[PDB]
Design an enzyme around this catalytic site. Sequence first.
Site, short mmCIF file in Angstrom:
data_model
loop_
_atom_site.label_atom_id
_atom_site.label_comp_id
_atom_site.label_asym_id
_atom_site.label_seq_id
_atom_site.Cartn_x
_atom_site.Cartn_y
_atom_site.Cartn_z
CE1 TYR A 75 -4.19 1.24 -0.33
CE2 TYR A 75 -3.71 2.59 1.58
CZ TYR A 75 -4.52 2.27 0.51
OH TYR A 75 -5.67 2.99 0.29
CE1 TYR A 118 -9.02 2.70 -3.95
CE2 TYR A 118 -8.57 0.67 -2.76
CZ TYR A 118 -8.39 1.47 -3.86
OH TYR A 118 -7.58 1.04 -4.89
CD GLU A 172 -6.24 -2.62 -4.71
OE1 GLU A 172 -5.96 -3.84 -4.78
OE2 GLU A 172 -6.50 -2.06 -3.63
NE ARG A 175 -2.77 -4.65 -2.21
CZ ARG A 175 -3.34 -3.67 -1.52
NH1 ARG A 175 -4.50 -3.15 -1.90
NH2 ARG A 175 -2.75 -3.21 -0.43
#
Length: 253
Positions: A75, A118, A172, A175
């Site tokens: 992150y 988020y 993302e 991932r």
Amino acid sequence: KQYPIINFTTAGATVQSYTNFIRAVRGRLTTGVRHEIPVLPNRVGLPINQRFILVELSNHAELSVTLALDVTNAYVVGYRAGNSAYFFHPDNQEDAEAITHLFTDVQNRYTFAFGGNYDRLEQLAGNLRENIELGNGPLEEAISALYYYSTGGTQLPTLARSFIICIQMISEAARFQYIEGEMRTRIRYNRRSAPDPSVITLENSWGRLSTAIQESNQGAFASPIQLQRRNGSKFSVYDVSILIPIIALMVYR
Ligand SMILES: CC1(C)Cc2cc(C(=O)O)sc2-c2ccccc21
Ligand SMILES: [Cl-]
């Protein structure tokens, strides 16, 4: 001693140049195996000189920012723009002591009052993920917006939206191979489009999918977690074999 640095630019970005970029992000993240799905390093016991990696981005206007990515959960923890560095509010003091080891050369260091999750970024941006375009265009615009925040030219709602774009196409995209494939399709056809419900659902389920896979017996889940097809209709998977081409990294559990 500087952290590993990965360079990507939106100026003339192709499907291949962005694929090699995300493939490089996964490589530096999974440096620290046996599992079928790679497992991100453990937070406890990880020495700080391998705690982060730097992802610098540039665009057609030759404007540059450098994002700081934690390696335990992939992150974004902060970013540097010019002579200034910006950090989200840390969760505990161990993470607040880790962030003072990045960008140790800037003159101006600032910690935001808010976290980088988020739901907070969507409140600040005034828009939800389903209403924020993704693609090379939205990414080139973000890069310009991240820097000009250091010069007082970008307001906070635009900055939060710019974080939402960047976090989705870097974090993302690393991932999930599915999300990387969605970004590659936008580059292929040169179109900007907001994420369909199958993408938000994966992003919110990353921690829950990381749970069920490492805790699986012979590969079978204890309780089924639910995903969404792109039309919003739902289903449920019960094992790891259907998600192997879908998820690429998992936070330790
Ligand atoms: C949710 C996700 C990642 C995306 C997806 C979208 C579908 C559709 O267009 O209906 S199906 C399908 C799917 C299937 C098996 C595992 C995972 C997924
Ligand atoms: Cl806050």
